[PDB]
């Protein structure tokens, strides 16, 4: 009945090591609206994360964009961590620069 979030993790621009970019976590297809989303750098929570205003699709499911400025490197790991009523535990999705 309740709907679990789909999660995409990706950059605004094609990733180029050492160049400033934006890390995005797009959560969509969920209901109800309350959702907890963190962006992580090597497992730790990034503090400066903004998000879009709550809106919804034609099927009434919600969507939100969370984002932060980042400068990717070869070694740094980025992830989005999401909790919602529908999840027994937080789901962690790693940024893959090819997706």
């Amino acid at each position: 009945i309740q709907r679990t979030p789909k999660i995409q993790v990706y950059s605004r621009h094609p990733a180029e090591n050492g160049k400033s970019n934006f890390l995005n976590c797009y959560v969509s297809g969920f209901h109800p609206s309350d959702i907890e989303v963190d962006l992580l750098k090597n497992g730790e929570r990034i503090e400066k994360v903004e998000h879009s205003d709550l809106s919804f699709s034609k099927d009434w499911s919600f969507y939100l964009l969370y984002y932060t400025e980042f400068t990717p490197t070869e070694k740094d790991e980025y992830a989005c961590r999401v909790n919602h009523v529908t999840l027994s535990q937080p789901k962690i999705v790693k940024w893959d620069r090819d997706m």
């Binding site: 995409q8 990706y10 094609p14 797009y26 109800p32 205003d53 709550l54």
Partner: protein
């Protein structure tokens, strides 16, 4: 449909955590331009695109007053819905509303919209005639009778055919540099071996506006509908959108695959191969 204007309200009860939150956003096409959040330190209707900023105090005050009156009404509607569904005052529930107008290239009304949901399920909708209602269940039939008696559809029709279209046209003029500009997708194909026997071909579309796009993979000119992984179109955060479509292909057969891209900003559809 050349352009649309939509307002979306979400009203969310939260027993024990104060009054239901009310969040409203307005869009022209795929561009947000206002929002309101009853939880903000100072709730008002606030600009979210530069072309709306020029509207004067009377505009912002009037929209603010509307959103405040609307937050109060949707709080009462949450209370009513609880009675209509025999539900307890202890659970959290959500009402959503969408309404707006679509105009063609010449700016005349193509069609109007006003639909409501309760807990993510269709509740009642104004029909395309802008005169009658479709109710999803016996609770919404109660509302339907009330709205029929009060001639509510007539009030929506007058808005949808009048102010909605006139203000949409105003916004499209004020925001013409962006609202009336399609940005075509930047496209390419990437190739990702998975084993000695298979590889993924991924067809990318980046930096496009508006969001509507079609990406399709053909093998020997036949659409691979059942075998294509398509991701949901996603915002880049700079107004534009991104999408990809991927197929797993036998090694040595990559050249039998073509990606086809349709978007309003393209003079003609694109065909890519790896």
């Amino acid at each position: 449909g050349s352009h649309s204007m939509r307002y979306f309200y979400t009203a969310m009860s939260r027993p024990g955590r104060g009054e239901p939150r009310f969040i409203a956003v307005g869009y022209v096409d795929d561009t947000q331009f206002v929002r309101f959040d009853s939880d903000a330190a100072s709730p008002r209707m606030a600009p979210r695109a530069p072309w709306i900023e020029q509207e004067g105090p009377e505009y912002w005050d009037g929209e603010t007053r509307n959103m405040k009156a609307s937050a109060q009404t949707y709080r009462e509607n949450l209370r009513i819905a609880l009675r209509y569904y025999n539900q307890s005052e202890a659970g959290s529930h959500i009402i959503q509303v969408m309404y707006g107008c679509d105009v063609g290239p010449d700016g005349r009304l193509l069609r109007g919209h006003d639909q409501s949901a309760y807990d993510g399920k269709d509740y009642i909708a104004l029909n395309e005639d802008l005169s009658s209602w479709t109710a999803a269940d016996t609770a919404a039939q109660i509302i339907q009778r009330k709205w029929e008696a009060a001639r509510v559809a007539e009030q929506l029709r007058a808005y949808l055919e009048g102010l909605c279209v006139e203000w949409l046209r105003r916004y499209l003029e004020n925001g013409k540099e962006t609202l009336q500009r399609a940005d075509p997708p930047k496209t390419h194909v990437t190739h990702h071996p998975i084993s000695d026997h298979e590889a993924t071909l991924r067809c990318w579309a980046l930096g496009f506006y508006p969001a509507e796009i079609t990406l399709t993979w053909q093998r020997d000119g036949e659409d691979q509908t059942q075998d294509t992984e398509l991701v949901e179109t996603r915002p880049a955060g700079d107004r534009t959108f991104q999408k990809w479509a991927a197929v797993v292909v036998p090694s040595g057969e990559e050249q039998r695959y073509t990606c086809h891209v349709q978007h309003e900003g393209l003079p003609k559809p694109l065909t890519l191969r790896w």
